Subunit: 229 residues, 3 copies
Amino acid sequence: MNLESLLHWIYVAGMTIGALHFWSLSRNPRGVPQYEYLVAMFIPIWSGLAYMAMAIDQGKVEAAGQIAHYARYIDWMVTTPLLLLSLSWTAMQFIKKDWTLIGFLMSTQIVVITSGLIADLSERDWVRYLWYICGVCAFLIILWGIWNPLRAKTRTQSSELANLYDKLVTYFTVLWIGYPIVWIIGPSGFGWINQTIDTFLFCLLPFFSKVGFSFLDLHGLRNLNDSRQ
Amino acid sequence: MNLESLLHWIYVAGMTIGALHFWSLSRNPRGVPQYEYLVAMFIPIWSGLAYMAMAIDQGKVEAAGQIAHYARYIDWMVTTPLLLLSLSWTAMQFIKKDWTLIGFLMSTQIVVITSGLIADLSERDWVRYLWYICGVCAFLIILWGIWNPLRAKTRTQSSELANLYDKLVTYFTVLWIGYPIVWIIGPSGFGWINQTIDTFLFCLLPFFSKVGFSFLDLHGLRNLNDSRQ
Amino acid sequence: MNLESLLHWIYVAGMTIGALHFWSLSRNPRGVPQYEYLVAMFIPIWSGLAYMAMAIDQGKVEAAGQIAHYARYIDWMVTTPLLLLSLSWTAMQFIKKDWTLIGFLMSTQIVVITSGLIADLSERDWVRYLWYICGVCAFLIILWGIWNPLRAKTRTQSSELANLYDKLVTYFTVLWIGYPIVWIIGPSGFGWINQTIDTFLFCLLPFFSKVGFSFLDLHGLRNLNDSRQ
Ligand SMILES: *C/C=C(C)/C=C/C=C(C)/C=C/C1=C(C)CCCC1(C)C
Ligand SMILES: *C/C=C(C)/C=C/C=C(C)/C=C/C1=C(C)CCCC1(C)C
Ligand SMILES: *C/C=C(C)/C=C/C=C(C)/C=C/C1=C(C)CCCC1(C)C
């Protein structure tokens, strides 16, 4: 709008080349799940065009003098659900049983996204303080509910898979808790920081959450097979 | 906090403890297997935080002087689809190449929800009368279309499962028809009612709709086994 | 109030009887099994009620003196995904372990519709010029990515099915490119054409698309097999 703001723009170029990297990297999975990078390719693609809008200021609406971050949560409505789901496929190379684990995960997932949905669509800073806690609370019960079965449930299913998923949830906990932290104080919450740095922070974090997550999947399996015939 | 309600607040309270009641009953289920409780667990959870918002007045926008209840249909945009799907899994234990039945019910479902979607997002009381007929219309075609195949198509598939379903659709119709009733005249009710009582009626109805199906599914199967191997 | 455009009213009318024509013809289809008609049944029904609203002037919002085509893209959020999906099932009769081809086209379609939303939700004719390019940009990358495997990948998979899909994508490409064309110049895209014509054109195109693909699906298989008794 007023130019001199190529922050969200450069972000776009970063996500674009990100997926292209896998295009030439196809030399990879040669007899092993291709779908792995497939879903991991769509995640950055969609999320890429999203930030592109944040640059052209196409997605915000003026309501009661308060700027609504509609496009902000939107991106967190498509990438997040697929980010946690991408982990389900990573561990489960084959499924046919009932939907108890993936289901309980998808359910609590909806309630969480809902929190951030209105969190950014908050007109008053007083009402936002309540919805914020509502989000961490839901994540508090599920977190403790998944900690025990992290190795207790797979005690009879698969011990090896337990170790892999053990470190997998480790990082998943640091990132998911990362956002809530910045939401505590500062801009868009309770601070004396300019609204400029506000977006500048919520931009680098996601990018830091995508990259780190990518290397995680590659380190999870760590295997190079060559068989398809 | 100037709004004297505290009703929507007490609603979410009893909802939280509702799902927790099962957490303690996990020692052993009754009537239906774990997976059944899984879906029946997410229904109250999400719908719970929803009402909590209705208390803090979080979910209402003023446009042209007319208030919109976008938060109201939202709760009926998540629970309802799962209310129609939950019952589907109640009768169908295993699935492979049979999806024509679930696909036909899911499709007509989207049409109904869409009705209530705009029904509340109406700016004029004149246009609302038109969109209303549209909702009941599609409901009358699917109803008469599901009444006959209730025991006609299941005459060869399964006669036992036919009787069960016959009792299911019974309470399913009286409820689905209950809402459009109050939707007839008056301020979203039977008329001669205020705005306060209005939200109160649409509050108890869902609570009566959720609790009804809960005990319905349990009594539906009524097996009570004790095998785990 | 104040009638002027009854085209949308007559649009839904012929749409209702359209799906009903197959209701009586259910005694026997045009070759494709009942399931094929199932998905093909929801496409017209839903789209019917959509236009019906356009007639009652319910779906557009007056903001900044500009008219928003909210309901316009809405139908392109549910119908479009089903327009291609229906074709996916037509080619893939049975499925077990794949989620490669389907999962690919599905993701690419998510980013496409996205641009279609903001396209009509644009507040400026300048920003809408950039968002559009994004839509066609992703369409070209995926197009060239499906052209080569359209016969290369199916060279060993299925030669017979390859030919069927070869002609399927042909018409699918013309229509998909059809809209982008009209979006270039004219109304809602820098032009001296009346606004009344804008809707008149964007209404006849979908109707030309739906009917076109309908006959296509029936011509794709063109075979009769009686095996039930
Ligand atoms: C790629 C972008 C990602 C993975 C963004 C993730 C955002 C979250 C996991 C946010 C979580 C939150 C809570 C758990 C409590 C409520 C506040 C939120 C939305 C920041
Ligand atoms: C748990 C909440 C539920 C099950 C809410 C259900 C709401 C309906 C079944 C509404 C149905 C309607 C029609 C059938 C006609 C159009 C008006 C509606 C939306 C009230
Ligand atoms: C039944 C209605 C249909 C199938 C409508 C389809 C619309 C499209 C395929 C639009 C495609 C577009 C692009 C590929 C980029 C330019 C923007 C759009 C939305 C016109």
